[PDB]
Amino acid sequence: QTVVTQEPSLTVSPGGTVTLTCASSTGAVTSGYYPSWFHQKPGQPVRALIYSTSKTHSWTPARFSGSLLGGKAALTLSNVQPEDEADYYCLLYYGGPQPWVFGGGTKLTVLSQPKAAPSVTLFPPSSEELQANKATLVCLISDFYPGAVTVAWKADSSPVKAGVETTTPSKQSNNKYAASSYLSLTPEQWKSHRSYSCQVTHEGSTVEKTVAPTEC
Amino acid sequence: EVQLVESGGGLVQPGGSLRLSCEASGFTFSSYWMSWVRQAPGKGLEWVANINQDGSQKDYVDSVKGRFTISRDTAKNSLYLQMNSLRAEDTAVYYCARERLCTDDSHMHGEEDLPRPSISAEPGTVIPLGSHVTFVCRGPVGIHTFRLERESRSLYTETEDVTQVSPSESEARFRIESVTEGNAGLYRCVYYKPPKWSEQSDYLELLVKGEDVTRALFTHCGGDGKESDYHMDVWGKGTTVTVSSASTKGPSVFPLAPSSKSTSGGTAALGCLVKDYFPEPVTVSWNSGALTSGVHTFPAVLQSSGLYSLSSVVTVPSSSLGTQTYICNVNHKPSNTKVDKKVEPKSC
């Protein structure tokens, strides 16, 4: 059941320095867990970077190096170049049966465009679909940078999580990302509440749209 | 040419079975532990299975226990995962990975001159917060510069202040007057005795008080520091294992009617919702492709139903909303389904 946690997304300027944590749910991360760090790029296999908390390889430049920091294993990048944009995973060794637990990952983005807040567009269920005994709310997110968004759905003002289905961000022609989120409801739940809302959080920037049953 | 190639992935209805194969190349397969690690689409890495050199011992993450078995054949020079009683969540890409074991042993490297240096901590490797600790770095007589590195190169201290301590040896000392939690970590000594530099010291672990350290001795990786360097040296490129209760199905199309949430400036958003189809692709055009500007069709979704859904949206002026016609052309060639539907302002 053991859980290993690292930052979901992080952003860096070309040349900057970033540090990625790796937190054991056991409460503390020592060198006896022997942390390891990996990156994965589109189309190419998981490469491995750091082991036993700091040990480097032939393919890894000294730009990359890790340490232990604040109860969590860390990976510190330096002179971050655009080639480094990738996803990064850590690994912990809990000796015994089931000795390997991976970290969630961190989508590291290197800024080549200025940050774009997302454009959110939210549609109510159609009159046709409701007559088919079904209800689908459509939340459409486009033209953002980096491609890291968090979506949460709101009944009147309380939160709802069931029936939510969200895409993974996908680069557009403009090299900005786009994603979709579909809330699935019964026509009763739809007509039941005053309103339903879609929150698009993108770089601490939350944007909330709303549609109402009492429409037309 | 050290390499691993996975194969045998494919598309299965739940409750079925597959066997993944992973052929090794460019190294002695017999000698390392091997593991299967899966990655479900859009999510991270999960370790699945672990097997020994000879097949003696093996374990599995709890999710796949009783359903998955892992094996290897050194004669066939490859690694097998038999996957029975497949569930939906088992859908992923499956990777083959070379585990590394206590290769961190008493001697794993070997180098002739120049002789590699030794590192020391006084009063110890475990120090109270806010106290003093000194790193003692020892090397040959006649060293020019002596450097104490930290985990990252570029975090380090060079010095020329070297003392000859024995007829054969000279040392350098690096002191930390009051310990900070930012001081804790891994240290290692190197020397420059011209013309070129040294091999590096062993690693040394510095810890603030609150822990107990018995640093290490001849018993390599023995207990508290169990056999590790589990750095999964080599990774394949995986194979896609797809588990689905889903057949060919044309989509059902609904009109996303331009609402009062027309984007400001006399431009509304028409939309067209392509719901519950399988498999991809779906192609969407408007007015037989006569409308291109403003059109944005989205990535589809994979719903828990195992069916895809999609949305195509065009931004368009409102004086236009009054006059002319706006039609979806939706084409699902896998079912040879073609749907035309006019999006319209809602009566209301």
Residue numbers in the entry:
A (entry chain L): 1 to 216
B (entry chain H): 1 to 348
Task: Quote the passages of the study that discuss this structure, keeping the authors' original sentences.
RIFIN also mediates immune suppression through activation of inhibitory immune receptors including leukocyte-associated immunoglobulin-like receptor 1 (LAIR1) and leukocyte immunoglobulin-like receptor B1 (LILRB1). Notably, human monoclonal antibodies that contain LAIR1-domain insertions in either switch region or between V and DJ regions have been isolated from donors, who have had malaria. To define the structural basis underpinning interactions between wild-type and antibody-inserted LAIR1 and polymorphic RIFIN, we investigated the overall architecture of three types of LAIR1-inserted antibodies, determined crystal structures of LAIR1 in complex with the RIFIN-interactive regions from two RIFINs (PF3D7_1040300 and PF3D7_0401300), and used the resultant structural information to derive a LAIR1-binding signature and to identify RIFINS from diverse Plasmodium species capable of recognizing LAIR1.
LAIR1-containing antibodies have distinct insertion modes, including type-1 insertion between V and DJ junctions in CDR H3 region, type-2 insertion in the S region between VH and CH1 region, and type-3 insertion in the S region with deletion of VH and CH1 gene. Despite differences in architecture and flexibility, RIFIN binding capacity of LAIR1-insertion appeared similar as assessed by co-IP and electron microscopy (EM) analyses of a chimeric MGJ5/MGD21 antibody in complex with RIFIN.
